[PDB]
């Protein structure tokens, strides 16, 4: 389910920038859905669309530029433009649209998960992210890198947040074929255990040691596994045995 506005206000203003995902074109212009300011459809004209082949580029699905000309803040009629774009402004507009889309994606999985309204979620998100920081996707990115933006307002859901984090991003399988020929071995094994965990280690067979490495954002798990391997290697070199790593 997808509904309601992205920002605080329902209808846009003068000069502010938007974008359409065009379903059908060529009659008057395009009366298609927006993804920057509400899912309710607005209209572009076939006059301020051509700048410099014209019927082939847009068509279906592709991202196309919009700027709000005239607003009827009474019943619901929105005027949009492509040619007016402030030069390179097109690129900026596109970026903004992309950000909006990403934000929408973010607040869709959580809506389906906790079975709670999307509009409310949007309201709860778009205040220290969409107003203070700039756009919300960038804020989210910042949070993922180092958490600072989410701390402003208290979250009603933590499981949802966790899910979101997971989506943004995890156990990685690791098998170490331990084939030691050492004098004292059990102690060495214990020592290894005492360093590698400080993650989830399980034993099925005597020579085989099964370990699953926890990853923060998938790519970080390579650094830990390698470290563990190194530690293991260190462990048995002093005593007099060997550990084979696949």
Task: For 78-93, give the DSSP string.
Answer: EEEESSSS-TTHHHHH
Binding range to another protein, per CB under 8 A, among 7-15, 56-64, 85-93, 224-232: 56-64
Q: Please give the span between the terminal C-alpha atoms of the chain, in angstroms, as a whole number.
A: 46
Q: E strand or H helix at 189, and its extent?
A: helix 186-196
Question: Which residue, 59 or 218, is less far from another protein as judged by CB?
Answer: 59
Residue 109's nearest CA partner among 170, 52, 161, 67 is 161
Q: How far apart are CA 21 and CA 24, in angstroms?
A: 9
In 3-state terms, what secondary structure has residue 132?
Answer: coil
Q: How far apart are CA 67 and CA 82, in angstroms?
A: 7
Is 161:169 a contact under the CB 8 Å cutoff?
A: no
What tokens were used for 50? 């051509």
The total of other beta-carbon atoms located within 10 Å of residue 5's CB is: 19
Residue 240's nearest CA partner among 160, 167, 184 is 184
What tokens were used for 239? 């005593």
The total of other beta-carbon atoms located within 10 Å of residue 12's CB is: 24
Question: Which residue, 56 or 202, is less far from another protein as judged by CB?
Answer: 56
Question: Which residue, 58 or 243, is less far from another protein as judged by CB?
Answer: 58
Closest contact distance (angstroms) between CB of 63 and another protein is 13
Closest contact distance (angstroms) between CB of 58 and another protein is 10
Using CB under 8 A as the binding rule, whether residue 56 contacts another protein is answered as yes
Question: Which residue, 5 or 82, is less far from another protein as judged by CB?
Answer: 82
Q: E strand or H helix at 177, and its extent?
A: strand 171-178
Using CB under 8 A as the binding rule, whether residue 1 contacts another protein is answered as no
Closest contact distance (angstroms) between CB of 219 and another protein is 23
Closest contact distance (angstroms) between CB of 137 and another protein is 24
Report how many residues bind another protein under the rule CB under 8 A.
5
Question: Which residue, 57 or 203, is less far from another protein as judged by CB?
Answer: 57
Figure out which of the listed residues 1, 52, 53, 205 binds another protein, where binding follows CB under 8 A: 53
Closest contact distance (angstroms) between CB of 30 and another protein is 16
Closest contact distance (angstroms) between CB of 42 and another protein is 24
Using CB under 8 A as the binding rule, whether residue 59 contacts another protein is answered as yes
Question: Which residue, 24 or 244, is less far from another protein as judged by CB?
Answer: 24
Binding range to another protein, per CB under 8 A, among 10-18, 48-56, 84-92, 198-206: 48-56
Question: Which residue, 23 or 105, is less far from another protein as judged by CB?
Answer: 23
What does the binding site for another protein look like in residue numbers (CB under 8 A)? Answer: 53, 55-57, 59
């Amino acid at each position: 389910t997808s509904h309601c506005r992205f920002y605080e206000n329902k209808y846009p203003e003068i000069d502010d920038i938007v974008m359409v995902n065009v379903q059908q074109i060529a009659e008057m212009g395009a009366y298609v859905k927006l993804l920057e300011y509400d899912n309710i459809e607005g209209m572009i004209l076939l006059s301020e669309l051509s700048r410099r082949s014209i019927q082939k580029l847009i068509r279906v699905g592709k991202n196309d530029v919009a700027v709000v000309l005239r607003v009827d803040k009474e019943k619901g009629y929105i005027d949009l433009s492509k040619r007016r774009v402030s030069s390179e402004d097109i690129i900026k507009c596109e970026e903004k649209y992309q950000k909006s889309k990403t934000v929408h994606s973010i607040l869709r999985y959580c809506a389906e998960k906790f079975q709670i309204p999307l509009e409310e979620l949007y309201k709860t998100i778009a205040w220290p992210l969409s107003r203070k920081f700039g756009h919300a996707y960038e804020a989210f990115k910042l949070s993922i890198i180092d958490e600072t933006v989410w701390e402003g307002i208290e979250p009603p859901s933590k499981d949802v947040l966790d899910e979101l984090k997971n989506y943004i991003s995890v156990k990685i399988r690791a098998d170490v074929e331990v084939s030691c020929f050492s004098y004292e071995g059990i102690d060495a094994i214990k020592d290894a255990l005492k360093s590698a965990e400080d993650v989830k280690v399980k034993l099925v067979a005597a020579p085989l040691y099964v370990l699953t490495t926890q990853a923060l954002d998938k790519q970080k798990g390579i650094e830990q596994l390698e470290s563990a391997i190194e530690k293991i290697t260190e462990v048995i070199t002093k005593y007099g045995g060997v550990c084979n790593i696949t």
